[PDB]
From a paper:
To answer this question, we reacted TssM193–490 with ubiquitin–PA and solved the crystal structure of the covalent complex to a resolution of 1.62 Å. The asymmetric unit contained two monomeric copies of TssM ∼ Ub-PA complexes, which could be superimposed with an RMSD of 0.488 Å (2,026 atoms). TssM193–490 was fully resolved, with the exception of a short linker region near the N-terminus (Pro-202 to Leu-207), which was not resolved in chain A. The comparison of the apo and the ubiquitin-bound form revealed no major conformational changes upon ubiquitin binding; the DUB domains of the apo- and Ub-bound structures align with an RMSD of 0.35 Å (1,115 atoms). The contact surface, has a size of 977 Å2, whereas USP7 and USP12 use ubiquitin recognition surfaces that are almost double in size (1,729 and 1,816 Å2 respectively). Most prominently, the linker region between α-7 and β-6 (residues 473–486) is in an optimal position to coordinate the S1-ubiquitin. Because of its analogous role to the missing Fingers region, we named this region Littlefinger. The Littlefinger residues Gly-480, Val-482, and Phe-475, together with Tyr418 (Thumb subdomain) form extensive hydrophobic interactions with the Ile-44 patch, but not Ile-44 itself. In addition to recognizing the Ile44-Patch, the Littlefinger loop stabilizes the ubiquitin C-terminus via hydrogen bonding to the main chain of Leu71 and Leu73. TssM further stabilizes the ubiquitin C-terminus through a hydrophobic interaction between Tyr-443 and the penultimate residue Gly-75. Arg-72 is also stabilized by TssM but uses a non-conventional contact with Glu-485 in the Littlefinger region, supported by Gln-375.
The betaproteobacteria Burkholderia pseudomallei and Burkholderia mallei, causative agents of melioidosis and glanders, respectively, encode the TssM effector, the only known bacterial DUB belonging to the USP class. By solving the crystal structures of isolated TssM and its complex with ubiquitin, we found that TssM lacks the entire “Fingers” subdomain of the USP fold. Instead, the TssM family has evolved the functionally analog “Littlefinger” loop, which is located towards the end of the USP domain and recognizes different ubiquitin interfaces than those used by USPs. The structures revealed the presence of an N-terminal immunoglobulin-fold domain, which is able to form a strand-exchange dimer and might mediate TssM localization to the bacterial surface.
Numbering used by the authors:
A (entry chain B): 1 to 75
B (entry chain A): 191 to 201, 207 to 490
The structure:
Amino acid sequence: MQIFVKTLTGKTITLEVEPSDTIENVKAKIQDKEGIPPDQQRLIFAGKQLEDGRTLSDYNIQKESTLHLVLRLRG
Amino acid sequence: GPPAVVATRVPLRRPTIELEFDRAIEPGSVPHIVLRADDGTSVAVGPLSWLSDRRIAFAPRKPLKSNSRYEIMVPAGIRSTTGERSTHPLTSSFDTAPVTPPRGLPNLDGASCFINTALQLAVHSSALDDILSNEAVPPAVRTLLEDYDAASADALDAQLAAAVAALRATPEVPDSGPGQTLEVMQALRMPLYDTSSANNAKNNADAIRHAPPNTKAFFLNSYPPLSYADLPNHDRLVAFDYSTGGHYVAYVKRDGIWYRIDDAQVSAVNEQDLLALPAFNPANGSVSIEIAIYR
Ligand code: NA
C-alpha cells in the first residue's frame, strides 16, 4: 500500500509499505530516499509519535494515510 | 479592616523573609506561619523577630528547594491590636531562584552546544536539587550544577570540562560530536512529560495545558511543533531549548528577564525577540523547541 510522509521542508515522500512494517522499517525507507538517519527522524500520525517496535497496523495507518516527518538534527 | 500584608521582602536555601502588615498585630496571634511548596508541603519557620509592631522577620527551619516557588501563609486568626481578626489566611509568594544574570558555558570541545544548552535548562529547573542528590548522575555534573552561580571563571571552565567528559562517557550521550538536548536530559535523569503520551490531547500545546497539576518539564514530541507564542502558561515558563537544526541555544528567565545563551555568549533579550522565533527551520525541516521548563 501507499502512504505519504509530509515534511516541514514542504516535501511529500511517497512510500510503498505493508501494514506489518515496523516503524524502524519505515524510517529505513526514508533514510534510503532522503539520507536522514533514523535517530534524527520523528514520525507522527494523528498527533502521536510512532514508536520503533510498533507496526503501521498498530496505529491504524491504512492505504493513502498521511504521516508527518519532523527532523531532529544534531547540534 | 482585618490585618493585611502590605509588603514582603526577601533580602538562598534558608532566606530571611520580612512581612509588613497594614497595622499593629497582636503578637500572640501569629504562632505558625509556614511556607508551602507547590504540592502543599509545609515548612515551618523559626522565631519571629518583631522589627516593629507591624513588621516581622523569620526564616524557614529547614532548607528550601532550589528554583522553587513558596507561598508564605499566615493562617486565619491573626488579629490587629485594634481587635479585627482575619477570617481567611494571608498569603504572599516568592521564588528561591537567583536574580543575577546567568553565565555562559563555552563550547570547549567544539561540538557541545547541545550539552551546554541542556545544562542551562537543568540549572534553571525546579528539578535541580533532585539532580544534585541523584547518585546515577555523574558527580562532575552535580559539581558543576551546584556552584554554577558562585564558581570563578577558571573553576567554572574546569568543572564544565569535567562535566562534559562525564556526560560523554554515559550511554545516552554521544562519545564525541554533536547531539540532541534530550540525550543530556536522560543522562541527568530529569523526568520529562512527553506530550505525545498524553491521554487527553492530540497536539503539543493541549498536552501541556491539560497535564497533571504541577508538571514542570515537557518534551514536545507531538505535532505541530510550537513557537514561543504557542507555549502555554508564559507566566510560569522559565526555560526552553532552541535548535536551528545544527546548533542549539538556551533561553532562560531570571527575575522576569529572558536571556539567550549561545554557549559562552549571554544576551538579555526582549519578549519581541522570543515572539519572532519560528517553530521549525523550513529550510531543513528540523524542530526548534523540544524541551520546555516551567517553575
Ligand atoms: Na557516550
